[PDB]
């Protein structure tokens, strides 16, 4: 194809996107540009075919943040906390309208989980490379998403909104039974479910507004803390589960009702609720149980009219039981785990979906389902469920300008980045053992650096432990290892 406009016609889309505004910074802004520009070179032999507009804070400009010079165009925005810049929906819209751009990519963090952003963009004829307003609330809000999950017949752990049920919508009166309007209704909910409990803000993102509660005397101040951490957000109470496996299903949906899973990720290796090690695929679950978890994830996405990328998170037990925990209405930082085993470029798929390209017209998806790479033949994703199989294994490891891309001479199958704080290394292998081995050697090469001496040791130690090698870990594993 000669241009984005020709691509849209040839591949059956309905919206020409030549310019995208990035409502983010750091690795997110860099990853979106790198992934899309690679796809653009493959399609148009011009990596700049889809132009990128970036938002620049005085802080990011003073730091000489790499995403600024990478961008085709940059826009200085007001400094300070993200509510004045990156997370300011009114500012994002104003810039989108002014250039103008044809789509917005929010990534992870900032305004990526604010349902007003796609709402205002749609009103102005601007696409959002993420779910529509409706689907983002009913699946992103924790109380509402658990009610949708229950409506779909997906199991959930005992919580303040247990028993509640009914394209779908959760009415405010039903929703209001699931939440704890005050500390007193909360104390009551905690007593019904039974201690130990979790007080959780439903609008909380990245582990914010969550408190572990062992007894009723501790409850009120812990409730007051959750209110203070995520102000304005409704609050719910849930049973604090036993040590389990934390699993994720990667979802991808177009604008036409087609939604698929891109296998799963195991994110059980956690330290103070922070995801430390991720793996793709999620080998711990029984193939039949994981297939069920995948179908539930697709049903749940289809029910609310979900579009773009999403993550369905589950708590899994050795019993073979699983419980819906939440839906992440955006791309995650650990998404390359999936990209590598599924051979799906996630930001490019988000772009194509926003251009109205059906899933069956995306080369990556066609290949995944074993059909012609350039054909227009519709795919029955339900009938070809056994057809996709992961290509090898990936291990992701959390490590502790603004973005330094870290290249390894020890391995061709390992890559990473360090941000300014934390970063991630990604190791592919033909199988799990082969992927852990490459990670160790890469972390050992990384160990030769000064700043990465102490930090990489505990990771090398955890990766070599018999429990990890034998995949006999759980959510409480790391926290008791120290």
**Main sheet overview:** 9 strands, antiparallel
Q: Radius of gyration from the CA trace?
A: 22 Å
Q: If you consult CATH, what is the topology of the largest domain?
A: D-amino Acid Aminotransferase, Chain A, domain 1
Number of strands: 17
Continuous helix count = 19
The CATH homologous superfamily name of the largest domain equals ATP-grasp fold, B domain
Q: Please state roughly what percent of the residues sit in beta strands, choosing from under 5%, 5-15%, 15-25%, 25-35%, 35-45% or over 45%.
A: 15-25%
Reconstruct the topology from this structure.
Blueprint: H1 4-10, E1 19-22, H2 26-44, E2 51-56, H3 58-62, H4 67-70, E3 73-76, H5 89-98, E4 103-105, H6 116-123, E5 127-128, H7 133-140, H8 142-151, H9 172-178, H10 183-193, E6 197-201, E7 210-213, H11 219-229, E8 235-239, E9 245-253, E10 259-271, E11 274-280, H12 287-304, E12 308-316, E13 322-328, H13 336-342, H14 346-354, H15 363-368, E14 393-399, E15 403-407, E16 414-419, E17 422-429, H16 432-446, H17 455-464, H18 466-469, H19 477-481
Parallel strand pairs: 1-2, 1-4, 2-3, 4-5
Antiparallel strand pairs: 6-7, 6-8, 9-10, 9-12, 10-11, 11-14, 12-13, 14-17, 15-16, 16-17
PDB class: ligase
Keywords: ligase
Assembly: monomeric
